[PDB]
Design a protein around this ligand. Structure first.
Ligand SMILES: O=C(O)c1cncc(C#Cc2ccccc2)c1
Lengths: 141, 134
């Protein structure tokens, strides 16, 4: 497999390769004739840098998906202090979302991310992922 | 101090007052939500501020940007990271039944306003395993 100068590849390139290997095990539909964005994977935690690398690598591995930027999560129970109402207060935990056209491919991608990050050192192995569904889809522009 | 955000919150509260469904659970997990997008960046921001005031039981992301969808024609598709000018935010909720109520309330609220507010779109979403908000 390809190796960059000095015998190393960037982390996001190695994520893309690892995702490609895992996804190759599952020959599931990634697209529909309707082309609606009805499924997704919600990815969070770890660290901003680890999510940055995972986001870039997911994009490289999967042309059939669409990704949000990195952003931040609000708190759960008992938000931290701030001048704004509690629902708005931002934690330091980051997230991004992947939009997908099929529910099964969201499940396969969720499992692939979980399997991949378990092989990486902290904080990357602390990344969390859940499938999500959009009842009416998201009409991406 | 912020009459604009408080007016939006009052309009939302009036719509939400017609329902009495549970907004919280003993489990306290964030298993549903509403995904709100379009309009304009500023109108979405204003709606987000009003929602925070009307619904203490929810949690909100900041605004962010949507990627593109499919391009018509045979030409190139956008790369997965390409960002559009269309923004979104997410509302996290502890019950799906209240997510459905909030989605209906937002739809009813924004359709009373001029563009671009009335162009805001909303869908219920669900998280299979929940989101462990910190
Ligand atoms: O002006 C904005 O940017 C904006 C954004 N989102 C929602 C609203 C509203 C309302 C509203 C509707 C009925 C009664 C009271 C308030 C306004």
């Amino acid at each position: 497999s390809h190796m960059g100068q000095g015998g190393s590849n960037p982390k996001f390139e190695n994520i893309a390769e690892g995702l490609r290997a895992l996804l190759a095990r599952s020959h599931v539909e990634r697209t529909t004739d309707e082309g609606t964005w009805v499924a997704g994977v919600f990815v969070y935690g770890g660290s901003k840098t680890s999510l940055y690398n995972l986001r870039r690598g997911t994009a490289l591995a999967i042309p059939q998906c669409r990704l949000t930027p990195l952003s931040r999560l609000p708190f759960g129970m008992a938000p931290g202090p701030g001048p704004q109402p509690g629902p708005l207060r931002e934690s330091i935990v980051c997230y991004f979302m992947v939009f997908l056209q099929t529910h099964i491919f969201a499940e396969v991608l969720k499992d692939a991310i979980k399997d991949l990050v378990m092989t990486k050192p902290a904080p990357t192995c602390n990344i969390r992922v859940t499938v999500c569904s959009f009842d009416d889809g998201v009409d991406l522009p």
